[PDB]
Ligand binder design. Structure first.
Ligand SMILES: [Mn+2]
Ligand SMILES: [Mn+2]
Ligand SMILES: [Mn+2]
Length: 183
């Protein structure tokens, strides 16, 4: 079957922290988590103690005309069990952020019960393993001396072909998961 996937960037009055708290049902929404079946983040730099700490910095330090994150949304196969959905979502997140270790946060939602879906926000900053304070992470990159500037930005999510290529990738992933699940 077809599992539609869409995507958009957040710079108008978009707040990374608010978005992260909403999809994970954290913070103010801590008293309404039934909609969240799973949540996970990855590739977070050392200064981050909690995923939200990364989004807080992004909101407090990224320049106005900067890309706070790329939000991706995709439906999950209903036949799959929750564990199978968890593995699939994680697997696909790695597919999009694993090469360049782009920090990300994803959450799986129980759309009613007939429409399970996944929200995934990707930070377009390359984690090179070099420690940088929160106030320095989003500064401009310094090619000559990486440790003295911000994390380098990635252009991998900007190409025009990226959307359909991601859809084809998601399809290949969902399909693969379905067959080895018996379906
Ligand atoms: Mn892959
Ligand atoms: Mn990884
Ligand atoms: Mn949702």
């Amino acid at each position: 079957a077809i599992y539609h996937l869409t995507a958009k960037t957040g710079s108008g009055g978009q707040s990374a922290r608010a978005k992260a708290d909403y999809i994970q049902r954290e913070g103010k929404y801590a008293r309404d988590m039934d909609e969240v079946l799973h949540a996970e983040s990855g590739h977070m730099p050392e200064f981050v103690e909690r995923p939200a700490d990364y989004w807080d910095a992004a909101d407090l330090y990224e320049r106005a005309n900067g890309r706070l994150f790329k939000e991706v949304e995709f439906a999950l196969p209903v036949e799959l069990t929750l564990d199978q959905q968890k593995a699939l979502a994680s697997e696909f997140a790695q597919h999009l952020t694993g090469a360049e270790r782009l920090p990300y946060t994803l959450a799986i939602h129980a759309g009613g019960g007939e429409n399970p879906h996944c929200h995934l926000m990707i930070s377009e900053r390359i984690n090179d393993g070099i420690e940088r304070p929160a106030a320095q992470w989003f500064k401009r990159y310094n090619g000559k001396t990486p440790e003295k500037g911000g994390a380098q930005k990635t252009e991998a999510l900007k190409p025009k072909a990226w959307l359909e290529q991601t859809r084809e990738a998601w399809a290949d992933h969902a399909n693969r998961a379905l067959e080895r699940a018996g379906h």
